[PDB]
Design brief:
The chain is an alpha+beta fold. The longest helix has 18 residues. It is elongated, with a radius of gyration of 18 Å. The structure holds the ligand O=C(O)[C@@H]1C[C@@H](O)N(c2ccc(F)cc2F)C1. Ligand Z24 binds next to strand 1 and helix 2. Belongs to the protein kinase superfamily. Ser/Thr protein kinase family. CDC5/Polo subfamily. This is Serine/threonine-protein kinase PLK1. It is found in: Nucleus; Chromosome, Centromere, Kinetochore; Cytoplasm, Cytoskeleton, Microtubule organizing center, Centrosome; Cytoplasm, Cytoskeleton, Spindle. GO terms for molecular function: anaphase-promoting complex binding; ATP binding; identical protein binding; magnesium ion binding; microtubule binding; protein kinase activity; protein kinase binding; protein serine kinase activity.
Length: 218
């Protein structure tokens, strides 16, 4: 089953949640940190225009992408000129804006509209910290937006309090961005051992459920 690491992520989340890390008593959350699992990629900005066009987003490396409603993806690298186009069937090709390709004129123009909106009206998430993936799929609930990247990472942005989770199954790690914009990366195995606060635990339970929904909609 090639489900872009979701089954692994779900396994990792079941085990930690099953351990009931908020009940430990003697809780030592700091001992579960591991800055060697700090993620390289996450979504720093997003704009949902899914009624008409698609979902536009910026990655922390300043590349921008769009997942169109026709289920193709266009990625503009941070050089502002190199494009990666992912067709319906997963087939990838590379081009440049400057070659002014008839084929992708409309989709490039849209990506540029998204790009400019984000630069003028949105703030960069994770800004206070230092292969290029595309957005595989996303959905939103009343409480959050869930973004699944092609590298297996799942990001969950909670609207309410602006907290964010970035789950990386390759490292069996989770990064938590709290309301104060503080940024902490944990090994899930070590959260099972040392435990955590009710807040992070609750969001990890929520994450399991969101990963289930992603797996249920392939
Ligand atoms: O006709 C136009 O110029 C397009 C249509 C509008 O939805 N566009 C748009 C789409 C997404 C944005 F973030 C900003 C925009 F201006 C521009």
């Amino acid at each position: 089953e090639f489900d872009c690491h979701l089954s692994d992520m779900l396994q990792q989340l079941h085990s930690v949640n099953a351990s009931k890390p908020s009940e430990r008593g003697l809780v030592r959350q700091e001992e579960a940190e591991d800055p060697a699992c700090i993620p390289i990629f996450w979504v720093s900005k997003w704009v949902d225009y899914s009624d008409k066009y698609g979902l536009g987003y910026q990655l922390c490396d300043n590349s921008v992408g769009v997942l169109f409603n026709d289920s193709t993806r266009l990625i503009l690298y941070n050089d502002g000129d190199s494009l990666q186009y992912i067709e319906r069937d997963g087939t990838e090709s590379y081009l440049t804006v400057s070659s002014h390709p008839n084929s992708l004129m409309k989709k490039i123009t849209l990506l540029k509209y998204f790009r400019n909106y984000m630069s003028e009206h949105l703030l960069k998430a994770g800004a206070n910290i230092t292969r290029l993936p595309y957005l595989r799929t996303w959905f939103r609930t009343r409480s959050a937006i869930i973004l699944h990247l092609s590298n297996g990472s799942v990001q969950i942005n909670f609207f309410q309090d602006h907290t964010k989770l970035i789950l990386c199954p390759l490292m069996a790690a989770v990064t938590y961005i709290d309301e104060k914009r503080d940024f902490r990366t944990y090994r899930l195995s070590l959260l099972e051992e040392y435990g955590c606060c009710k807040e992070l635990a609750s969001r990890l339970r929520y994450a399991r459920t969101m990963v289930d929904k992603l797996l249920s909609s392939r």
